[PDB]
Amino acid sequence: MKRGFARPTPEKPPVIKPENIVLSTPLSIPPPEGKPWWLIVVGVVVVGLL
Amino acid sequence: GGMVAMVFASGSHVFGGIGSIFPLFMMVGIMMMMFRGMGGGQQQMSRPKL
């Protein structure tokens, strides 16, 4: 002998929420600017030699 | 040259012999800056970038 059991309408499951995400584009390296260091080196010598 | 001549006319004669090396080295240094030197933004192709 067994106990009776009636299945009701299933209870509401927790809702899943999908998502669409686009990644940020990386940074770009600063290109190689160059100073004429030697020019000022001659400069300080000339004003000094004076 | 005007400075040296003024000193020569005044009679110091300090620039005689090896003393002359100072005007000589200076005159070469000024020449390096004015004739070759380095360019501005109009000459984009500077050695380090090319």
**C-alpha dist (Å) from residue A5 to A8, A9, A14, A25:** 10, 13, 25, 59
Neighbours of A42 (CB within 10 A): 15
C-alpha–C-alpha distance, residues B13 and B5, integer Å: 10
Among residues A45, A3, A8, which one has the least CA distance to residue B32? A45
Would the CA dihedral through B17, B20, B21, B24 be positive or negative?
negative
Which residues of A fall within a CB distance of 8 Å from B46?
A: 34
**C-alpha dist (Å) from residue A6 to A3, A9, A27, B24:** 10, 10, 63, 114
C-alpha–C-alpha distance, residues A29 and A6, integer Å: 69
- Annotated resolution, angstroms: 4.5
Tell me how the structure was determined: cryo-EM
Query: How many helical (H) and strand (E) elements, i.e. helices and strands, does chain B have?
Result: 2, 0
At B10, which helix (H) or strand (E)? helix B2-10
Whether B29 sits inside 8 A of A49 (CB atoms) is: yes
- First-to-last CA distance in chain B? 39
- Contact residues for B14 (Cβ-Cβ < 8 A; gap 6+): B7
Taking CA–CA distances from B47, the nearest residue in chain A reads A34
C-alpha–C-alpha distance, residues A29 and A21, integer Å: 25
